[PDB]
Amino acid sequence: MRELIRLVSSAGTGHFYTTDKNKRTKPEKIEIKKYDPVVRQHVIYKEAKIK
Amino acid sequence: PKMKTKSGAAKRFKKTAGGLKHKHAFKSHILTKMTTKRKRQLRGTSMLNKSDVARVERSLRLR
Amino acid sequence: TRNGRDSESKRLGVKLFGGQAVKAGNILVRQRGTKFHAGYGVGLGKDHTLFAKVDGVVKFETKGAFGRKYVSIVAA
Amino acid sequence: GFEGGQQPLHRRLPKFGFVSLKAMDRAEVRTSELAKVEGDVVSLQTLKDANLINQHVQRVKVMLSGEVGRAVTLKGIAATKGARAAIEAAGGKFED
RNA sequence: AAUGGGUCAGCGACUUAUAUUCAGUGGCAAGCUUAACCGUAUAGGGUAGGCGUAGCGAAAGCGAGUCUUAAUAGGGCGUU
RNA sequence: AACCCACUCCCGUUGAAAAGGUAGGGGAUGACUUGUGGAUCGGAGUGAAAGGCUAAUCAAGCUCGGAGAUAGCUGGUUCUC
RNA sequence: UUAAAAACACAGCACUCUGCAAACACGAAAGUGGACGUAUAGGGUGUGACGCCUGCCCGGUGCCGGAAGGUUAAUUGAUGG
RNA sequence: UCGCUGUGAAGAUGCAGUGUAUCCGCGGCUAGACGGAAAGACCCCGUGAACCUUUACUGUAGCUUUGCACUGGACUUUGA
RNA sequence: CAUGCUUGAGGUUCUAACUCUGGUCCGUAAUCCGGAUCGAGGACAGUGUAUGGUGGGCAGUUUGACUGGGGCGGUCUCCUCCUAAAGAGUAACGGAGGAGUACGAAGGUGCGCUCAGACCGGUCGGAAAUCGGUCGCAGAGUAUAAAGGCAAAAGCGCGCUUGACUGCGAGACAGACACGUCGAGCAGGUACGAAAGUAGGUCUUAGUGAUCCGGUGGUUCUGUAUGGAAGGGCCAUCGCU
Ligand SMILES: [Mg+2]
Ligand SMILES: [Mg+2]
Ligand SMILES: [Mg+2]
Ligand SMILES: [Mg+2]
Ligand SMILES: [Mg+2]
Ligand SMILES: [Mg+2]
Ligand SMILES: [Mg+2]
Ligand SMILES: [Mg+2]
Ligand SMILES: [Mg+2]
Ligand SMILES: [Mg+2]
Ligand SMILES: [Mg+2]
Ligand SMILES: [Mg+2]
Ligand SMILES: [Mg+2]
Ligand SMILES: [Mg+2]
Ligand SMILES: [Mg+2]
Ligand SMILES: [Mg+2]
Ligand SMILES: [Mg+2]
Ligand SMILES: [Mg+2]
Ligand SMILES: [Mg+2]
Ligand SMILES: [Mg+2]
Ligand SMILES: [Mg+2]
Ligand SMILES: [Mg+2]
Ligand SMILES: [Mg+2]
Ligand SMILES: [Mg+2]
Ligand SMILES: [Mg+2]
Ligand SMILES: [Mg+2]
Ligand SMILES: [Mg+2]
Ligand SMILES: [Mg+2]
Ligand SMILES: [Mg+2]
Ligand SMILES: [Mg+2]
Ligand SMILES: [Mg+2]
Ligand SMILES: [Mg+2]
Ligand SMILES: [Mg+2]
Ligand SMILES: [Mg+2]
Ligand SMILES: [Mg+2]
Ligand SMILES: [Mg+2]
Ligand SMILES: [Mg+2]
Ligand SMILES: [Mg+2]
Ligand SMILES: [Mg+2]
Ligand SMILES: [Mg+2]
Ligand SMILES: [Mg+2]
Ligand SMILES: [Mg+2]
Ligand SMILES: [Mg+2]
Ligand SMILES: [Mg+2]
Ligand SMILES: [Mg+2]
Ligand SMILES: [Mg+2]
Ligand SMILES: [Mg+2]
Ligand SMILES: [Mg+2]
Ligand SMILES: [Mg+2]
Ligand SMILES: [Mg+2]
Ligand SMILES: [Mg+2]
Ligand SMILES: [Mg+2]
Ligand SMILES: [Mg+2]
Ligand SMILES: [Mg+2]
Ligand SMILES: [Mg+2]
Ligand SMILES: [Mg+2]
Ligand SMILES: [Mg+2]
Ligand SMILES: [Mg+2]
Ligand SMILES: [Mg+2]
Ligand SMILES: [Mg+2]
Ligand SMILES: [Mg+2]
Ligand SMILES: [Mg+2]
Ligand SMILES: [Mg+2]
Ligand SMILES: [Mg+2]
Ligand SMILES: [Mg+2]
Ligand SMILES: [Mg+2]
Ligand SMILES: [Mg+2]
Ligand SMILES: [Mg+2]
Ligand SMILES: [Mg+2]
Ligand SMILES: [Mg+2]
Ligand SMILES: [Mg+2]
Ligand SMILES: [Mg+2]
Ligand SMILES: [Mg+2]
Ligand SMILES: [Mg+2]
Ligand SMILES: [Mg+2]
Ligand SMILES: [Mg+2]
Ligand SMILES: [Mg+2]
Ligand SMILES: [Mg+2]
Ligand SMILES: [Mg+2]
Ligand SMILES: [Mg+2]
Ligand SMILES: [Mg+2]
Ligand SMILES: [Mg+2]
Ligand SMILES: [Mg+2]
Ligand SMILES: [Mg+2]
Ligand SMILES: [Mg+2]
């Protein structure tokens, strides 16, 4: 099925977003830009683990 | 003897001048599948409903 | 028997009828699809809910090609 | 609290907050209450010579509520910004 | 053609204590009231304590404001 | 035969009797019957075993306490406008 | 005190345990029974004079034997944080 | 303190219509008074009770394994 | 290697602890019990404490509801249609079907384009492959049931992209409560477009589980004499056929 993952901001903040992904069809990591409330810009967010 | 307050009711409701405060439910876990708007609107504090005041006040020994 | 199922009703239909006074943000129709189309001064939600963006009264008119039914807001 | 077997409110909502032990020794005084101490001096002991505060209070703050009667001197008692201006207005000073 | 009673006389079932909330009726009033205990013992003393005069916040805290928030924007609660 | 038992019919069933009687019936020197005294008992005793017996009470005796146990169940609840 | 029987017991048969301070049972324990007995004895279990016999299965569950190797308690306290 | 046919909490001495019938005993018989007796034992219900069973759950007497204590000397094998 | 100093484990042996429901002496008039002494066993056995296994021998309990009586069978939450009487709602062990997901593009935006089917002509296919022409108007398609929708197509393709954004939120719909639904507009930063603008996921309606407890990332809160720490609070988020 789809497994819960965690997107950690590339800035120094500890802010993160949560989503799910199909780890069988798409094994490679996600590199997406999302708004970071602490620093107040859009920055690269990188996939990590939820556990 | 003195009336005994319910311990679990006093940990969930606080007495203010506008009524009784409490937090919202459905916010402990299973949060990923929830809309951000829905989680944002369950974040603050709400006053007790009109039809629930009588039962809670009796539990708190306020009436 | 293998039939005893059903789902809970959704309370759809027209909420404000023609000629009623409206305020901004009022819900006019709850819909599946667009039985009615958003006229002047009316917005459409993602579940096709029609809501009032301005103040006035409901009009309800069948105009244009395609024979569509429109709900608009006009000044009283 | 019984509802027939349905989950009741005192078990359906979450617990929140903690109790401040630092506020046990706290008290607040209205500006209208200042003109009740004996003479021209407001201190922790002087408010206990009257019956303004309990005998276990160690910290006192003065908030603007009502008019200040006469000129008084405050001794180690905090006041709000609005309350201080009322106190200085009626000839009273603010030291310690 | 469901229950109870053969009849008479006597007895026989919403009470009391302590904590409270609302209403009526009184005393004082920005203040009201004492508890144990003294006592000339239903008086008088005893104002420790309780409630009220300010709220908001989980809290530090700030205060006619305060919390949320980057925001004196909006919104919640409170204030003549 | 005595004595111990209790297979059948009838009577009796408010009985003469809270388990009998009249007729018949089985054992009757034995794993017999019986007197006096004694030992084992309440989750315990005893039982050639029927869940039988333990003072007319036994799928856990009687008595006094916890005790006014608990009863979302029946019954009742007293003068007048 | 509504069932006397085809039910229980029985002599005979078999399995199994027990080397004596026996197994086993009643006892917080001392102790007592077994037994002032000693494997031709004692306890438990099933079957039930006598005659002819009592066939196949050790996969399950139990019991007995084995001890190599895997797991495995209190205990110990290297190492890291 | 009658019969019949209907009605009716649905099988009537007591209701409706109708028919019969002076008042009161005694000896007999049991068709009815849903006759007397026992707050149905069959059936269902109660977040009732007892006792029994087991590879239901949680425990536990008894039996058993090992560490420490009561608990010592010597020799030998053997790992750090 | 040779020893020294410990210390894990095993075996043998000794007597001196312990044990004897073995003998003979005394207390003593005594098959109890003590003391003495021979004999035997012997650091074993046994008892206390800690711990693993077994343990209906014994104990306290649990073992749902609906139901044309109970039991057996079936059902129990969510979505779509009919029943449902032209606003909403509306029951039956009434009649019919689905769900307990999927997608980093199947989302956003700008630009561009229309299907199914039929007939004629055309090399291996011939009813049906790719092709050219005419008609066709949605009889196609929509990730997934059914219903309601779809030309500004909500259907199809391409380039760039991350708005599947953070804080809110006037006003409503639903509604016993706890929950649920829609949303203009404001502030921050964005993405596509020349621009007006559009974008707070997907044509819509199923794809879900409260509180307690425990874990992980932050935190100008608190922190039992004080400074810290442990613990607690707040925000985010994980673990329930
Ligand atoms: Mg408490
Ligand atoms: Mg949730
Ligand atoms: Mg949390
Ligand atoms: Mg059905
Ligand atoms: Mg329905
Ligand atoms: Mg419906
Ligand atoms: Mg929109
Ligand atoms: Mg005081
Ligand atoms: Mg009668
Ligand atoms: Mg009856
Ligand atoms: Mg009845
Ligand atoms: Mg009655
Ligand atoms: Mg009667
Ligand atoms: Mg008054
Ligand atoms: Mg405000
Ligand atoms: Mg207000
Ligand atoms: Mg005799
Ligand atoms: Mg005869
Ligand atoms: Mg006879
Ligand atoms: Mg005879
Ligand atoms: Mg004979
Ligand atoms: Mg004798
Ligand atoms: Mg006795
Ligand atoms: Mg008993
Ligand atoms: Mg039986
Ligand atoms: Mg007796
Ligand atoms: Mg008896
Ligand atoms: Mg009691
Ligand atoms: Mg009673
Ligand atoms: Mg009754
Ligand atoms: Mg016989
Ligand atoms: Mg008999
Ligand atoms: Mg028998
Ligand atoms: Mg034998
Ligand atoms: Mg037999
Ligand atoms: Mg036989
Ligand atoms: Mg084998
Ligand atoms: Mg076997
Ligand atoms: Mg073995
Ligand atoms: Mg007559
Ligand atoms: Mg009739
Ligand atoms: Mg009749
Ligand atoms: Mg009558
Ligand atoms: Mg009549
Ligand atoms: Mg009449
Ligand atoms: Mg007669
Ligand atoms: Mg007779
Ligand atoms: Mg009769
Ligand atoms: Mg009767
Ligand atoms: Mg009764
Ligand atoms: Mg009854
Ligand atoms: Mg029965
Ligand atoms: Mg139950
Ligand atoms: Mg119940
Ligand atoms: Mg012995
Ligand atoms: Mg001796
Ligand atoms: Mg010796
Ligand atoms: Mg030993
Ligand atoms: Mg040992
Ligand atoms: Mg031991
Ligand atoms: Mg031991
Ligand atoms: Mg059992
Ligand atoms: Mg049991
Ligand atoms: Mg068990
Ligand atoms: Mg048992
Ligand atoms: Mg109990
Ligand atoms: Mg039970
Ligand atoms: Mg249960
Ligand atoms: Mg039932
Ligand atoms: Mg049925
Ligand atoms: Mg029926
Ligand atoms: Mg069933
Ligand atoms: Mg309708
Ligand atoms: Mg209608
Ligand atoms: Mg209904
Ligand atoms: Mg289904
Ligand atoms: Mg699509
Ligand atoms: Mg359709
Ligand atoms: Mg077009
Ligand atoms: Mg409404
Ligand atoms: Mg641009
Ligand atoms: Mg722009
Ligand atoms: Mg729990
Ligand atoms: Mg400290
Ligand atoms: Mg901390």
CSV table of N, CA and C (backbone and C1' of nucleotides) in Angstrom, one decimal, chain E residues 12-34:
chain,number,residue,atom,x,y,z
E,12,G,P,-48.1,4.0,63.1
E,12,G,O5',-47.8,3.0,61.9
E,12,G,C5',-46.6,2.3,61.8
E,12,G,C4',-46.5,1.5,60.5
E,12,G,C3',-46.7,2.4,59.2
E,12,G,O3',-45.5,2.9,58.7
E,12,G,C1',-48.2,0.5,59.1
E,13,A,P,-45.1,4.4,58.9
E,13,A,O5',-43.8,4.6,58.0
E,13,A,C5',-43.6,5.7,57.1
E,13,A,C4',-43.3,5.2,55.7
E,13,A,C3',-44.0,6.0,54.6
E,13,A,O3',-43.2,7.2,54.3
E,13,A,C1',-44.4,3.7,54.2
E,14,C,P,-43.8,8.6,54.7
E,14,C,O5',-42.7,9.6,54.1
E,14,C,C5',-41.3,9.6,54.6
E,14,C,C4',-40.4,10.4,53.7
E,14,C,C3',-40.9,11.9,53.4
E,14,C,O3',-39.7,12.7,53.3
E,14,C,C1',-40.7,10.7,51.4
E,15,U,P,-39.8,14.2,54.0
E,15,U,O5',-39.1,14.0,55.4
E,15,U,C5',-39.8,13.5,56.5
E,15,U,C4',-39.0,12.8,57.4
E,15,U,C3',-37.6,13.4,57.8
E,15,U,O3',-37.7,14.3,58.8
E,15,U,C1',-37.3,11.1,57.2
E,16,U,P,-37.1,15.8,58.7
E,16,U,O5',-35.6,15.6,59.3
E,16,U,C5',-35.4,15.1,60.6
E,16,U,C4',-34.0,14.5,60.8
E,16,U,C3',-32.9,15.4,60.3
E,16,U,O3',-32.5,16.3,61.3
E,16,U,C1',-32.6,13.2,59.5
E,17,A,P,-31.8,17.7,60.9
E,17,A,O5',-30.3,17.3,60.6
E,17,A,C5',-29.5,16.8,61.7
E,17,A,C4',-28.2,16.3,61.2
E,17,A,C3',-27.4,17.2,60.3
E,17,A,O3',-26.7,18.2,61.0
E,17,A,C1',-27.4,15.0,59.3
E,18,U,P,-26.7,19.7,60.4
E,18,U,O5',-25.5,19.7,59.4
E,18,U,C5',-24.2,19.3,59.8
E,18,U,C4',-23.4,18.7,58.7
E,18,U,C3',-23.2,19.7,57.5
E,18,U,O3',-22.2,20.6,57.8
E,18,U,C1',-23.7,17.5,56.7
E,19,A,P,-22.0,21.9,56.8
E,19,A,O5',-21.3,21.4,55.5
E,19,A,C5',-21.0,22.3,54.4
E,19,A,C4',-20.9,21.5,53.1
E,19,A,C3',-21.4,22.3,51.9
E,19,A,O3',-20.4,23.2,51.4
E,19,A,C1',-22.3,20.1,51.9
E,20,U,P,-20.8,24.7,51.2
E,20,U,O5',-22.2,24.7,50.5
E,20,U,C5',-22.3,25.4,49.2
E,20,U,C4',-22.9,24.5,48.2
E,20,U,C3',-24.0,25.1,47.3
E,20,U,O3',-23.5,25.9,46.2
E,20,U,C1',-24.7,23.0,48.0
E,21,U,P,-23.8,27.4,46.1
E,21,U,O5',-25.0,27.4,45.0
E,21,U,C5',-24.8,27.0,43.7
E,21,U,C4',-26.1,26.6,43.0
E,21,U,C3',-27.2,27.6,43.1
E,21,U,O3',-27.1,28.5,42.0
E,21,U,C1',-28.1,25.5,43.7
E,22,C,P,-27.7,30.0,42.3
E,22,C,O5',-29.2,29.9,42.2
E,22,C,C5',-29.9,29.7,40.9
E,22,C,C4',-31.3,29.4,41.0
E,22,C,C3',-32.2,30.4,41.7
E,22,C,O3',-32.6,31.4,40.9
E,22,C,C1',-32.7,28.2,42.6
E,23,A,P,-33.0,32.9,41.5
E,23,A,O5',-34.4,32.7,42.2
E,23,A,C5',-35.6,32.5,41.5
E,23,A,C4',-36.7,32.2,42.4
E,23,A,C3',-37.1,33.2,43.4
E,23,A,O3',-37.9,34.3,42.9
E,23,A,C1',-37.0,31.0,44.4
E,24,G,P,-37.8,35.7,43.6
E,24,G,O5',-38.6,35.6,45.0
E,24,G,C5',-40.0,35.4,44.9
E,24,G,C4',-40.5,35.0,46.3
E,24,G,C3',-40.3,36.0,47.4
E,24,G,O3',-41.3,37.0,47.4
E,24,G,C1',-39.6,33.9,48.2
E,25,U,P,-40.9,38.5,47.8
E,25,U,O5',-40.5,38.4,49.4
E,25,U,C5',-41.5,38.2,50.4
E,25,U,C4',-40.9,37.9,51.7
E,25,U,C3',-40.0,39.1,52.2
E,25,U,O3',-40.7,40.1,52.9
E,25,U,C1',-38.8,37.0,52.5
E,26,G,P,-40.1,41.5,53.1
E,26,G,O5',-39.1,41.3,54.4
E,26,G,C5',-38.0,42.2,54.6
E,26,G,C4',-37.1,41.6,55.7
E,26,G,C3',-35.8,42.4,55.9
E,26,G,O3',-36.0,43.5,56.7
E,26,G,C1',-35.4,40.1,55.8
E,27,G,P,-35.1,44.8,56.4
E,27,G,O5',-33.7,44.5,57.1
E,27,G,C5',-33.6,44.1,58.5
E,27,G,C4',-32.2,43.7,58.8
E,27,G,C3',-31.1,44.7,58.4
E,27,G,O3',-31.0,45.8,59.4
E,27,G,C1',-30.5,42.5,57.9
E,28,C,P,-30.3,47.2,58.9
E,28,C,O5',-28.8,46.9,58.9
E,28,C,C5',-27.9,47.7,58.1
E,28,C,C4',-26.7,47.0,57.8
E,28,C,C3',-25.9,47.6,56.6
E,28,C,O3',-25.1,48.7,56.9
E,28,C,C1',-26.1,45.2,56.3
E,29,A,P,-25.3,50.1,56.1
E,29,A,O5',-24.5,49.8,54.7
E,29,A,C5',-23.2,49.4,54.7
E,29,A,C4',-22.9,48.6,53.4
E,29,A,C3',-23.0,49.3,52.1
E,29,A,O3',-21.8,50.1,51.8
E,29,A,C1',-24.0,47.2,51.9
E,30,A,P,-21.9,51.4,50.9
E,30,A,O5',-21.2,50.9,49.5
E,30,A,C5',-19.9,51.1,49.2
E,30,A,C4',-19.0,49.9,49.6
E,30,A,C3',-17.5,50.0,49.3
E,30,A,O3',-16.8,49.3,50.3
E,30,A,C1',-18.4,48.2,48.1
E,31,G,P,-16.5,49.9,51.7
E,31,G,O5',-16.8,48.7,52.7
E,31,G,C5',-18.0,48.5,53.3
E,31,G,C4',-18.8,47.4,52.6
E,31,G,C3',-19.3,46.3,53.5
E,31,G,O3',-20.4,46.6,54.3
E,31,G,C1',-18.5,45.4,51.5
E,32,C,P,-20.4,46.0,55.8
E,32,C,O5',-21.0,44.5,55.7
E,32,C,C5',-22.1,44.3,54.9
E,32,C,C4',-22.3,42.8,54.7
E,32,C,C3',-22.0,41.9,55.8
E,32,C,O3',-23.2,41.8,56.7
E,32,C,C1',-20.9,41.0,53.9
E,33,U,P,-22.9,41.7,58.3
E,33,U,O5',-22.3,40.2,58.5
E,33,U,C5',-23.1,39.0,58.2
E,33,U,C4',-22.3,37.8,58.1
E,33,U,C3',-21.5,37.4,59.3
E,33,U,O3',-22.2,36.8,60.3
E,33,U,C1',-20.1,37.2,57.4
E,34,U,P,-22.3,37.4,61.8
E,34,U,O5',-20.8,37.2,62.4
E,34,U,C5',-20.4,36.0,63.1
E,34,U,C4',-19.8,35.0,62.2
E,34,U,C3',-19.2,33.7,62.9
E,34,U,O3',-20.2,32.8,63.1
E,34,U,C1',-17.6,34.6,61.4
